[PDB]
Amino acid sequence: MAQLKADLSNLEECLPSTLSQEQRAVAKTQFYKELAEKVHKFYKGKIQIMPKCTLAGFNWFNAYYTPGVSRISTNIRDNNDSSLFYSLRGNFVGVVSDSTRVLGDGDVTPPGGLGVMEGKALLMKYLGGIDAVPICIDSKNKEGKNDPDAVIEFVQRIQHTFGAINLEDISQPNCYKILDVLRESCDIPVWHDDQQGTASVTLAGLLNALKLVKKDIHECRMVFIGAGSSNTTCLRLIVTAGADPKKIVMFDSKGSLHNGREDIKKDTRFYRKWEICETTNPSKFGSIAEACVGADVLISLSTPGPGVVKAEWIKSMGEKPIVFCCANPVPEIYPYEAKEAGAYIVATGRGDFPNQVNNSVGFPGILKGALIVRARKITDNMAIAASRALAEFAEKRGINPDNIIGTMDEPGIFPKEAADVAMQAIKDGVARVTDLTWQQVYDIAEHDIKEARESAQLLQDSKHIVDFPQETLNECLAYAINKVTG
Amino acid sequence: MAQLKADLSNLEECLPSTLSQEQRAVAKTQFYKELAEKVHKFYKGKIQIMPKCTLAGFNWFNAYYTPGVSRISTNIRDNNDSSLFYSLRGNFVGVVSDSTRVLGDGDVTPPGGLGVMEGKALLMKYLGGIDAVPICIDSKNKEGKNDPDAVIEFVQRIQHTFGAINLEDISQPNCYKILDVLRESCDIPVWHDDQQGTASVTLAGLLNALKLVKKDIHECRMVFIGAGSSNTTCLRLIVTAGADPKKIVMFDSKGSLHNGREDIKKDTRFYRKWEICETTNPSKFGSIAEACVGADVLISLSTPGPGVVKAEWIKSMGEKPIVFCCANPVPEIYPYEAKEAGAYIVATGRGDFPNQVNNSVGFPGILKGALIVRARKITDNMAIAASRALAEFAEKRGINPDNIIGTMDEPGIFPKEAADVAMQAIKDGVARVTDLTWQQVYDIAEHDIKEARESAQLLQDSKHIVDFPQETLNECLAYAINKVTG
Ligand code: NA
Ligand code: NA
């Protein structure tokens, strides 16, 4: 009977009432997987390059090209900073990955990260008014090992094209060295989305969840399952934001993190883990299950599910448990099971369940802010300033257990983030532009965003972007429904 | 007196009658440099990123991003070639430069090449239907010398992002090593626009120039001023197309090329000049002036900086001299100086003089053709096919001493280049897509270029690209005039 609308807004209604809750969840994930396959091929990707300058007539090329363009090359040679306003550089972000950790799918090979990086680049334009491209590279050295110095050298060479570097999907602990070095060696800001960007949105999420459960951040026990770059960065911001590290426990694959973890202390590449080891889990919990009894908050970024976070764990938590399970493409548990177990607030990293806690609602504002005041780097306080803007944006339009965080469907989030991030950067002493107010940044970010969204809509109404075929949609739903019944 | 039109078509008439020929030439140069400065700052560059996929509703992000995008990650991992259609890669060109030979300005530091590489990317979209971005890199090693191996390594790592690589503005002999190695090692086509690109359009102009003066290619004495990477490739294509090597002389800084250059002999980084030493200029001409008397064709692309072509060399040439002076931003001699000295046909690299012999009129068509049928390499044959296509397109609508070649205002040149280059790639055995006909390839090129042009036009007509202020046009004019009248 039911048929998807072109805007996909009625997917829930098109899934037969006969499916179980695990069948709806698995069908949702199969639909979007099969649809991704079809849509990417239909349009041959997701982004394109366009003029943004007047093409009124042939002779404009004499100013864009020879002979006129020569003044640009000499102006830049003599004053490198003018590359920021004479070329797209000022608004141009490289989305650099070696594809070693592309979502929960792992090392997907060097071109393998294109779908994800191209999606980041798309969201940067449409959400953030930022021009960005995917830069998927091979970081393998001559011995066939993915090598942090290969990526460091690369970015140092390519920095001159860009206004910021946005590292993505790089396995740990390479990603720490890559970022720790680049961030101080480059003349443009470099950061790792998976680090402060995930951490930023995770905090923003927790901030509002804590207002809805009426607890103070400092009194809350919190369990962190998985100890990769996202989770370690989340814990760090959460503590800076007022959480008591003594009430916190993190787990890697070998057990809990604590004083006695000599395996972690001796390998300094894992210094972020080792700091957590020195400062949290004073009780040295041996198991997740013990750690969760009474816990207030469970934050997971581990192996893709099903069944990695256990219903029993959640059942044993305190009053109005907050559960974030953000592994991709499949969360550690589906939201219907966690609510069955008693969770009051459940978040995942995907857009097809409520409460999407995903850096896509953080990077565009963090990046745009940093670009506008030319911040030298992305500081933790900047990241936190964006956590606050996002949490406050959502609160001020209404929040509840099934809507705790700003969504990708609310463009207003991003100039708010950009202006707060910009002022924090001036405050932290890392901005090179200091002559702009909160309002002036907001206005710049707002305009670029509106201009980006109106251009792209115009190109859709006119059918330079062709409508996707109704029939391929019908085919993706049948495909999804067949997988979970047949 | 007239003010400049929005479309810049009437600059000649806005330049005062009383100006001398020298003043008029210099004032055009200064006008376009000063307008380049103003317009690049006005739009903060020339190109932008834009969605090319449907954004009909929020849930679409679930296909473009987590969770759906994971299908793309794994699809690519298991079939790397599918990257060419599940992402922009299949139509994505990197304009790679170390900014070491950027026009006649030469080495402008790494970010200094951005003006020129952005104009190239702007042209690939608007003339060729190609998505392209500037990639300006630092190639300097620790000792601060430009290192070809750095460029080789860099491109090898980034190749995974792109459907082709378009090397630009790399100093010789580095450009040879980089091109020659990369074209064999990368799994996409790599070429150097200043090599086959420039030689493609140079041959095209020569073809029509020769028709106009009624001379057979093989019966012309040709003198080449400069042994740079452009001129070298110009000579080589012009020989393959049928010139007599015995009737040809090339000059470098130290005098004519001939088989007695021990000089060039053992430095095998310069093997291309060496092949030319073995095969040309049997006579051992002892000065450019000795060479030029009775010559038919004189071709210079001195890079960098200002080259020399003398009035007296031209005056000594034969019946109806053909003179190409393509140095940018100022040619070796201006057209009116070459005309006064007896030249019948004169080309420069600029669009503000007749007969613009510039790669911008060959690269959009070459790359587009190569991209469609997935050519592994850009062969010399393929470059030559584009030349015949360019020259024949021009001859069909009429050629004359002041209009010998197709212009950037004639968008039909490029689907025709694309289809001829494609067929040639199949014939050369470098095409990975072998069963499309000329018409099928033409159709794809034409449809892409038309979509790109109309998309761009819609964005201007809509005011998303703002009209450039008339007041600033008027200022640039006055500025230019003022520079020349004091
Ligand atoms: Na969610
Ligand atoms: Na010209």
Numbering used by the authors:
A (entry chain B), B (entry chain A): 1 to 486
Text of the article:
Malic enzyme (ME) catalyzes the conversion of malate to pyruvate through a two-step reaction. Upon incubation of rEhME with Eh cells or human enteric cells (Caco-2 and HT29), it was evident that EhME binds efficiently to both.
The crystal structure of EhME was determined at a resolution of 2.2 Å using the platinum single isomorphous replacement with anomalous scattering (SIRAS) method. The monomer structure is organized into five distinct domains. In the EhME structure, a water molecule occupies the putative metal-binding site, bridging hydrogen bonding interactions between the protein and a glycerol molecule. Notably, a sulfate molecule in the crystal structure mimics the 2′-ribose phosphate of NADP⁺ at its binding site. In EhME, the knotted structure appears to enhance structural resilience, allowing the enzyme to withstand mechanical and environmental stresses associated with its secretion.
